[PDB]
Amino acid sequence: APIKKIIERYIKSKADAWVSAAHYNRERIKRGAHVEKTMVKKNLGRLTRLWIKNEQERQRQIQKNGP
RNA sequence: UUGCCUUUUACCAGAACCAUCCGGGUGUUGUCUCCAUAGAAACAGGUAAAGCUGUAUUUUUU
Ligand SMILES: [Mg+2]
Numbered sequence: 001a002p003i004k005k006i007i008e009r010y011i012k013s014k015a016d017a018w019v020s021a022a023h024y025n026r027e028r029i030k031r032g033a034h035v036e037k038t039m040v041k042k043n044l045g046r047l048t049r050l051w052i053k054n055e056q057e058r059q060r061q062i063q064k065n066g067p
Numbered sequence: 068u069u070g071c072c073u074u075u076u077a078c079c080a081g082a083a084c085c086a087u088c089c090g091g092g093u094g095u096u097g098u099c100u101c102c103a104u105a106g107a108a109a110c111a112g113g114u115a116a117a118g119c120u121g122u123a124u125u126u127u128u129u
Pocket residue numbers: none
């Protein structure tokens with residue numbers, strides 16, 4: 001259990017870093033700043049995965065406490 | 068922080084910080100150079116030349 005805890009923590013940290021980075025990027029993209037074509041694709045990918053995660057979490061929520 | 072862009076150098080041109088560099092000033096020492104190269108002149112005056120002053124009838128002195 002302790003290991004599972006620790007890893008859960010560290011991925012939450014990493015996850016936090018990721019999500020915030022993504023958010024920063026998307027504002028940056030909106031602004032129309034210098035940004036790497038590759039970087040923009042990366043951000044698109046991240047934000048998609050993020051969106052899917054959000055979405056299916058909402059599905060879970062819907063299930064877990066009725067319509 | 069913007070721009071070109073989009074990958075970095077290289078860059079756009081603004082900011083704030085800072086540094087580098089091309090030079091500069093004096094002052095003092097010292098050297099290098101070109102010229103030099105005297106160990107004593109005044110006083111008494113005269114000569115000539117330079118620095119100031121001078122050319123009584125009510126308050127300065129007639
Ligand atoms: Mg590469």
